Design a protein around this motif. Structure first.
Motif, mmCIF file in Angstrom:
data_model
loop_
_atom_site.group_PDB
_atom_site.id
_atom_site.type_symbol
_atom_site.label_atom_id
_atom_site.label_comp_id
_atom_site.label_asym_id
_atom_site.label_seq_id
_atom_site.Cartn_x
_atom_site.Cartn_y
_atom_site.Cartn_z
ATOM 1 N N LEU A 169 19.958 -6.944 -7.393
ATOM 2 C CA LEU A 169 19.655 -6.175 -6.192
ATOM 3 C C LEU A 169 18.755 -5.020 -6.617
ATOM 4 N N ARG A 170 17.709 -4.747 -5.840
ATOM 5 C CA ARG A 170 16.781 -3.661 -6.151
ATOM 6 C C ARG A 170 16.142 -3.040 -4.915
ATOM 7 N N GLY A 171 15.307 -2.027 -5.150
ATOM 8 C CA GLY A 171 14.623 -1.330 -4.073
ATOM 9 C C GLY A 171 13.635 -2.246 -3.386
ATOM 10 N N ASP A 172 13.583 -2.176 -2.059
ATOM 11 C CA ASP A 172 12.671 -2.998 -1.268
ATOM 12 C C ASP A 172 11.249 -2.888 -1.787
ATOM 13 N N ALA A 173 10.531 -4.003 -1.737
ATOM 14 C CA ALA A 173 9.148 -4.044 -2.182
ATOM 15 C C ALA A 173 8.332 -4.870 -1.193
ATOM 16 N N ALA A 174 7.278 -4.257 -0.668
ATOM 17 C CA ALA A 174 6.388 -4.914 0.276
ATOM 18 C C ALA A 174 5.466 -5.842 -0.503
ATOM 19 N N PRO A 175 5.133 -6.996 0.077
ATOM 20 C CA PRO A 175 4.260 -7.996 -0.544
ATOM 21 C C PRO A 175 2.809 -7.567 -0.713
ATOM 22 N N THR A 176 2.171 -8.103 -1.747
ATOM 23 C CA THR A 176 0.755 -7.877 -2.018
ATOM 24 C C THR A 176 0.193 -9.226 -1.607
ATOM 25 N N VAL A 177 -0.629 -9.241 -0.574
ATOM 26 C CA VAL A 177 -1.171 -10.489 -0.066
ATOM 27 C C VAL A 177 -2.635 -10.728 -0.404
ATOM 28 N N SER A 178 -2.929 -11.967 -0.788
ATOM 29 C CA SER A 178 -4.279 -12.395 -1.125
ATOM 30 C C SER A 178 -4.516 -13.705 -0.391
ATOM 31 N N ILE A 179 -5.670 -13.842 0.253
ATOM 32 C CA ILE A 179 -6.012 -15.065 0.982
ATOM 33 C C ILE A 179 -7.312 -15.641 0.404
ATOM 34 N N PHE A 180 -7.327 -16.947 0.142
ATOM 35 C CA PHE A 180 -8.487 -17.611 -0.451
ATOM 36 C C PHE A 180 -8.991 -18.786 0.361
ATOM 37 N N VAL A 204 -6.696 -23.466 2.530
ATOM 38 C CA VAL A 204 -6.759 -22.015 2.587
ATOM 39 C C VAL A 204 -5.418 -21.593 1.985
ATOM 40 N N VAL A 205 -5.493 -20.876 0.862
ATOM 41 C CA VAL A 205 -4.318 -20.406 0.126
ATOM 42 C C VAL A 205 -3.990 -18.931 0.367
ATOM 43 N N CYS A 206 -2.705 -18.619 0.421
ATOM 44 C CA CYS A 206 -2.277 -17.253 0.633
ATOM 45 C C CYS A 206 -1.136 -16.933 -0.326
ATOM 46 N N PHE A 207 -1.309 -15.881 -1.127
ATOM 47 C CA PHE A 207 -0.308 -15.455 -2.103
ATOM 48 C C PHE A 207 0.372 -14.180 -1.659
ATOM 49 N N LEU A 208 1.695 -14.215 -1.566
ATOM 50 C CA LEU A 208 2.469 -13.043 -1.183
ATOM 51 C C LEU A 208 3.297 -12.706 -2.405
ATOM 52 N N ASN A 209 2.718 -11.871 -3.262
ATOM 53 C CA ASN A 209 3.319 -11.464 -4.520
ATOM 54 C C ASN A 209 4.188 -10.211 -4.545
ATOM 55 N N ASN A 210 5.179 -10.263 -5.429
ATOM 56 C CA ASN A 210 6.126 -9.190 -5.712
ATOM 57 C C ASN A 210 6.758 -8.454 -4.554
ATOM 58 N N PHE A 211 7.673 -9.111 -3.860
ATOM 59 C CA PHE A 211 8.360 -8.463 -2.757
ATOM 60 C C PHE A 211 9.860 -8.570 -2.965
ATOM 61 N N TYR A 212 10.614 -7.793 -2.196
ATOM 62 C CA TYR A 212 12.074 -7.799 -2.251
ATOM 63 C C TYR A 212 12.546 -7.129 -0.971
ATOM 64 N N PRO A 213 13.538 -7.712 -0.277
ATOM 65 C CA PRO A 213 14.311 -8.941 -0.522
ATOM 66 C C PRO A 213 13.487 -10.223 -0.479
ATOM 67 N N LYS A 214 14.103 -11.322 -0.899
ATOM 68 C CA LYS A 214 13.447 -12.627 -0.917
ATOM 69 C C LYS A 214 13.075 -13.124 0.478
ATOM 70 N N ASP A 215 13.858 -12.714 1.469
ATOM 71 C CA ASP A 215 13.687 -13.119 2.862
ATOM 72 C C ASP A 215 12.360 -12.706 3.496
ATOM 73 N N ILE A 216 11.507 -13.689 3.779
ATOM 74 C CA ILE A 216 10.194 -13.428 4.373
ATOM 75 C C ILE A 216 9.748 -14.624 5.217
ATOM 76 N N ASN A 217 9.053 -14.363 6.321
ATOM 77 C CA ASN A 217 8.581 -15.444 7.183
ATOM 78 C C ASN A 217 7.067 -15.399 7.328
#
Ligand SMILES: [Zn+2]
Ligand SMILES: [Zn+2]
Ligand SMILES: [Zn+2]
Ligand SMILES: [Zn+2]
Ligand SMILES: [Zn+2]
Ligand SMILES: [Zn+2]
Ligand SMILES: [Zn+2]
Lengths: 219, 222
Positions: A112-123, A137-150
């Motif tokens: 369990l850790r402090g919330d982290a917003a995603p770093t998004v990249s679209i290609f 078309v690829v999209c990377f949503l890196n380093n976020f927390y919690p795991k739950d994302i839509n």
């Protein structure tokens, strides 16, 4: 055979806090010689399982005594007094008193850790792919927390559900964050018929959807 | 240093058979039981059987009598497990392990495990992957740092090996698990570097697909 029930299925613990996992069996694990053959294993992400404890409470060599095991009969407990990053993984109980040996379903311990917003990249599609008559078309949503994302894709304002391929990584044993990849595959022709491609995400760290987009056109 | 080395991933056709090997070293092969464990779709382990290479004595889980046959070659210190007439349920990762329980002592010695062998039971054909470079346009993350990507799609079966700059660039990379869709797998990897590194220095995506004997290096050009 003996059924081994482990609870909880997953536990989120902050580094420094204690954690305990329960394991119940359909039969007493007390062998006729008076010994109880109950073991606890840990399977680190991408690693083979490793035994932590044997004979209910005896630690294996090289295992930190932060880990403790206890119980008897049909109820057993593994306790981690102070959890660290290295404790991330799935824990299992294995009974060897009755044949055949049976395992518990596993308990995933997540940091369990402090919330982290995603770093998004679209290609956009690479030249090579387009040549083959395909477009992804690829999209990377890196380093976020919690795991739950839509995440949802939108082309020219409308949600596109078909052709989406998502993939998530396990919790990173370095920053305790998650990352996910979303790829939308279309044909070259349809790709060249639309303008805006939007990768939209819904995460706890934002009251409004996290957006990333690009307009394909020419020049 | 006690070591158990297992054979590579296998693609088997329904109804056929496979012989998995578990080569050991660093200890007296004949004096310890070797057990085989099975793992399906993540958390779900099952004990198959154990063999005492010293005598050839074996014990099987009723569920596996007729499915698995354990042997051991003392001259080479290699334990084998043959699975016959494979079906759906047989696709899994199989591990071999010198469990370490010593009956006479009523106590344990350290357990050593092999890396695992992935068996895939399918009649689908082997396909070489297409590796596409992902240069940013909006996936730039602006300045400061920039992330590149690599798309490996339409290959069968697993696995595929993807590294950046021949293994040199190991930090900041994210390799996502391959997802199967329509008999083909797709896998992608992203690498975040500083704006100063790229495009100044080249970033290359390395991909290998043993099953096809395909090896390809894609250079992430702007
Ligand atoms: Zn019994
Ligand atoms: Zn009995
Ligand atoms: Zn439209
Ligand atoms: Zn329109
Ligand atoms: Zn459109
Ligand atoms: Zn339009
Ligand atoms: Zn002991």
């Amino acid at each position: 055979d003996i059924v081994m029930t482990q609870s909880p299925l997953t536990l989120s613990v902050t580094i420094g806090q204690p954690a305990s996992i329960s394991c119940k069996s359909s039969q007493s694990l007390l062998y006729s010689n008076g010994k109880t053959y109950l073991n606890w294993l840990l399977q680190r992400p991408g690693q083979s399982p490793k035994r932590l404890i044997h004979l209910v409470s005896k630690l294996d060599s090289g295992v930190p005594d932060r880990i403790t095991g206890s119980g008897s009969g049909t109820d057993f407990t593994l306790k981690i007094s102070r959890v660290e990053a290295a404790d991330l993984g799935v824990y299992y109980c294995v009974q060897g008193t009755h044949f055949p040996y049976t395992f518990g379903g596993g308990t995933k311990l997540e940091i369990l850790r402090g919330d982290a917003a995603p770093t998004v990249s679209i290609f956009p599609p690479s030249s090579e792919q387009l040549t083959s008559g395909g477009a992804s078309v690829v999209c990377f949503l890196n380093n976020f927390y919690p795991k739950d994302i839509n995440v949802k894709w939108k082309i020219d304002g409308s949600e596109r559900q078909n052709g989406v391929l998502n993939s998530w990584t396990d919790q990173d044993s370095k920053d305790s964050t998650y990352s996910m990849s979303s790829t939308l595959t279309l044909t070259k022709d349809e790709y060249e018929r639309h303008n805006s491609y939007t990768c939209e995400a819904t995460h706890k760290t934002s009251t409004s959807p996290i957006v990333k987009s690009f307009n394909r056109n020419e020049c | 240093e006690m070591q158990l080395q297992q054979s590579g991933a296998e693609l088997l056709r329904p109804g056929t058979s496979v012989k998995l090997s578990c080569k050991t070293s660093g200890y007296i092969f004949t004096s310890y039981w070797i057990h085989w464990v099975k793992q399906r779709s993540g958390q779900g382990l099952e004990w198959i059987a154990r063999i005492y290479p010293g005598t050839g004595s074996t014990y099987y889980n009723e569920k596996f009598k007729g499915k698995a046959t354990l042997t051991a070659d003392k001259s080479s210190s290699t334990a084998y497990m043959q699975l016959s007439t494979l079906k759906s349920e047989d696709s899994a990762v199989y591990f071999c392990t010198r469990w370490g329980f010593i009956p006479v002592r009523e106590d344990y010695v350290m357990d050593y495990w092999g890396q695992g062998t992935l068996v895939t039971v399918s009649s689908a054909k082997t396909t070489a992957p297409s590796v596409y470079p992902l240069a940013p346009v909006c996936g730039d993350t602006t300045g400061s740092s920039v992330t590149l990507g690599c798309l490996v799609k339409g290959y069968f079966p697993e696995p595929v090996t993807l590294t950046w700059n021949s293994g040199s660039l190991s930090s900041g990379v994210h390799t996502f698990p391959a997802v199967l869709q329509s008999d083909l797998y797709t896998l992608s990897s992203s690498v975040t570097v500083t704006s100063s590194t790229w495009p100044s220095q080249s970033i290359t995506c390395n991909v290998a697909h043993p099953a096809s004997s395909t090896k390809v290096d894609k250079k992430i050009e702007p």
